[PDB]
Enzyme design. Structure first.
Site, PDB file in Angstrom:
ATOM      1  N   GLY A   1       0.825  -1.202   0.000  1.00 50.90           N
ATOM      2  CA  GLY A   1       0.000   0.000   0.000  1.00 50.90           C
ATOM      3  C   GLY A   1       0.857   1.250   0.000  1.00 50.90           C
ATOM      4  N   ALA A   2       0.275   2.347  -0.473  1.00 53.22           N
ATOM      5  CA  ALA A   2       0.927   3.644  -0.411  1.00 53.22           C
ATOM      6  C   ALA A   2      -0.171   4.652  -0.165  1.00 53.22           C
ATOM      7  CB  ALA A   2       1.671   3.945  -1.687  1.00 53.22           C
ATOM      8  N   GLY A   3       0.104   5.581   0.744  1.00 50.35           N
ATOM      9  CA  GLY A   3      -0.861   6.584   1.146  1.00 50.35           C
ATOM     10  C   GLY A   3      -0.180   7.910   1.382  1.00 50.35           C
TER      11      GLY A   3
ATOM     12  N   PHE B   1       0.711   9.211   4.023  1.00 56.25           N
ATOM     13  CA  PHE B   1       1.675   9.239   5.142  1.00 56.25           C
ATOM     14  C   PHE B   1       2.814   8.222   5.046  1.00 56.25           C
ATOM     15  CE2 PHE B   1      -2.572  10.482   6.812  1.00 56.25           C
ATOM     16  CZ  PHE B   1      -2.319  11.832   6.895  1.00 56.25           C
ATOM     17  N   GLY B   2       2.857   7.474   3.949  1.00 59.21           N
ATOM     18  CA  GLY B   2       3.933   6.525   3.726  1.00 59.21           C
ATOM     19  C   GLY B   2       3.484   5.295   2.956  1.00 59.21           C
TER      20      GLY B   2
ATOM     21  N   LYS C   1       6.196  -0.652   7.708  1.00 60.41           N
ATOM     22  CA  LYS C   1       5.467   0.598   7.465  1.00 60.41           C
ATOM     23  C   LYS C   1       6.441   1.755   7.536  1.00 60.41           C
ATOM     24  CE  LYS C   1       2.277   2.507  10.297  1.00 60.41           C
ATOM     25  NZ  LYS C   1       0.935   2.585  10.953  1.00 60.41           N
TER      26      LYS C   1
ATOM     27  N   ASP D   1     -10.772   2.456  16.679  1.00 55.57           N
ATOM     28  CA  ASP D   1     -10.810   2.272  15.205  1.00 55.57           C
ATOM     29  C   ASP D   1     -11.109   0.794  14.920  1.00 55.57           C
ATOM     30  OD1 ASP D   1     -10.596   3.068  12.501  1.00 55.57           O
ATOM     31  OD2 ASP D   1      -8.472   3.573  12.622  1.00 55.57           O
TER      32      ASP D   1
HETATM   33  O1  LIG Z   1      -2.534  -1.169   5.952  1.00 58.95           O
HETATM   34  C1  LIG Z   1      -1.620  -1.924   6.237  1.00 58.95           C
HETATM   35  C2  LIG Z   1      -1.161  -2.943   5.216  1.00 58.95           C
HETATM   36  S1  LIG Z   1      -1.927  -4.502   5.515  1.00 58.95           S
HETATM   37  C3  LIG Z   1      -0.837  -5.514   6.464  1.00 58.95           C
HETATM   38  N1  LIG Z   1      -0.155  -5.157   7.561  1.00 58.95           N
HETATM   39  N2  LIG Z   1       0.419  -6.174   7.976  1.00 58.95           N
HETATM   40  C4  LIG Z   1       0.174  -7.236   7.177  1.00 58.95           C
HETATM   41  O2  LIG Z   1       0.638  -8.354   7.342  1.00 58.95           O
HETATM   42  N3  LIG Z   1      -0.648  -6.811   6.179  1.00 58.95           N
HETATM   43  C5  LIG Z   1      -1.082  -7.494   5.062  1.00 58.95           C
HETATM   44  C6  LIG Z   1      -0.664  -8.800   4.796  1.00 58.95           C
HETATM   45  C7  LIG Z   1      -0.908  -9.466   3.596  1.00 58.95           C
HETATM   46  C8  LIG Z   1      -1.617  -8.837   2.585  1.00 58.95           C
HETATM   47  O3  LIG Z   1      -1.863  -9.489   1.399  1.00 58.95           O
HETATM   48  C9  LIG Z   1      -3.166  -9.987   1.075  1.00 58.95           C
HETATM   49  C10 LIG Z   1      -3.673  -9.314  -0.183  1.00 58.95           C
HETATM   50  C11 LIG Z   1      -3.145  -9.665  -1.427  1.00 58.95           C
HETATM   51  C12 LIG Z   1      -3.605  -9.038  -2.586  1.00 58.95           C
HETATM   52  C13 LIG Z   1      -4.595  -8.062  -2.506  1.00 58.95           C
HETATM   53  C14 LIG Z   1      -5.119  -7.705  -1.264  1.00 58.95           C
HETATM   54  C15 LIG Z   1      -4.661  -8.331  -0.104  1.00 58.95           C
HETATM   55  C16 LIG Z   1      -2.044  -7.530   2.795  1.00 58.95           C
HETATM   56  C17 LIG Z   1      -1.788  -6.895   4.013  1.00 58.95           C
HETATM   57  C18 LIG Z   1      -0.941  -1.804   7.577  1.00 58.95           C
HETATM   58  C19 LIG Z   1      -1.648  -1.325   8.682  1.00 58.95           C
HETATM   59  C20 LIG Z   1      -1.015  -1.202   9.919  1.00 58.95           C
HETATM   60  C21 LIG Z   1       0.330  -1.550  10.056  1.00 58.95           C
HETATM   61 CL1  LIG Z   1       1.157  -1.399  11.646  1.00 58.95          CL
HETATM   62  C22 LIG Z   1       1.037  -2.024   8.953  1.00 58.95           C
HETATM   63  C23 LIG Z   1       0.405  -2.142   7.717  1.00 58.95           C
END
Ligand SMILES: O=C(CSc1n[nH]c(=O)n1-c1ccc(OCc2ccccc2)cc1)c1ccc(Cl)cc1
Length: 271
Positions: free
Chosen positions: A22-24, A26-27, A43, A134
């Site tokens: 992901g990209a947003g 804030f990072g 992150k 949240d």
């Molecule tokens: O928002 C996030 C990222 S999510 C995220 N954070 N930690 C984590 O393990 N995920 C995660 C893991 C697998 C994943 O893949 C499944 C997938 C594959 C294709 C399409 C869609 C889903 C997506 C997210 C985040 C939030 C809080 C923190 Cl502390 C870190 C990351």
């Protein structure tokens, strides 16, 4: 502790960022490896986008809230670009996972199992005098073994005196947030209990948006009349009555997360 004594600090060199998830504003969030072999989520903070103090406050809180049912802080890199490294959850967010072909095929029995697992993590948060603020399916992550963990502790707070009061200009998602928090900014663990009831609807509808066909003003209006969300399609009446307990008018009439856990475990073992 300062960074050179902090047990969570790791040299940036220990990490290889492999896939951007992901990209947003804030990072970014990446899948990566620590020391070659251990899969972690990374992150990163986009410099200038928000305070580095604000960003790291989340990791500091996680240092105090360690439990199997909560996404674990793995490490931090506190030099720019700042990283927060956390437990990798293979199946991503619950809201996304329930829509995948695997998620679609889950029985009500497994959905009730997952609800109990989430209640179990929230019961720990409750016992430790924290609140989350949240709580929603987007902030539950799912493991490769289809276990669930509470995530995203950005809004989470240690409670001293039962209650945290946000600034009077503060905004929260209307559909998920308890009426007293929307109206007065007052959050308690009982506010999270209300959110958990909303989260149960997301579980049973495979991630559908709460209050089908309603705008936020319509949701606020219905609630004030004493209506609650309409029974979701294919929701066991038992679960719906449990949601209703979460949505009691007086915060103190709402149940504890320990109670929710124990009831959902009974629902699960029955099914
Ligand atoms: O928002 C996030 C990222 S999510 C995220 N954070 N930690 C984590 O393990 N995920 C995660 C893991 C697998 C994943 O893949 C499944 C997938 C594959 C294709 C399409 C869609 C889903 C997506 C997210 C985040 C939030 C809080 C923190 Cl502390 C870190 C990351």
């Amino acid at each position: 502790k300062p960074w050179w004594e902090d047990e969570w600090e790791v040299p940036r060199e220990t990490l290889k960022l492999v896939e951007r998830l992901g990209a947003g504003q804030f990072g970014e969030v990446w899948m990566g490896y620590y020391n070659g072999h251990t899969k972690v989520a990374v992150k990163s903070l986009k410099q200038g986008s928000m305070s580095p103090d604000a960003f790291l406050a989340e990791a500091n809180l996680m240092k105090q809230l360690q439990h199997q049912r909560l996404v674990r802080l793995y490490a931090v890199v506190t030099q720019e670009p700042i990283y927060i490294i956390t437990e990798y959850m293979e199946n991503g967010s619950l809201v996304d996972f329930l829509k995948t072909p695997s998620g679609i095929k889950l029985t009500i029995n497994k959905l009730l199992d997952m609800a109990a697992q989430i209640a179990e993590g929230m019961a720990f948060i409750e016992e430790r005098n924290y609140i989350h603020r949240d709580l929603r399916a987007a902030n539950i992550l799912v493991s490769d073994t289809l276990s669930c963990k509470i995530a995203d502790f950005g809004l989470a707070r240690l409670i001293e005196d039962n209650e945290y009061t946000a600034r009077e200009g503060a905004k929260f998602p209307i559909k998920w947030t308890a009426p007293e928090a929307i109206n007065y900014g007052t959050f308690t663990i009982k506010s999270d209990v209300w959110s958990f009831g909303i989260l149960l609807t997301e579980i049973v509808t495979h991630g559908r948006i709460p209050y089908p066909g309603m705008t936020n003003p319509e949701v606020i209006q219905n609630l004030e009349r004493g209506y609650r969300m309409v029974r979701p399609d294919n929701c066991p009446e038992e679960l719906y009555q449990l949601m209703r307990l979460c949505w009691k008018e007086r915060p103190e009439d709402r149940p504890t997360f320990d109670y929710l856990r124990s009831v959902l475990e009974d629902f699960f073992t029955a099914t």
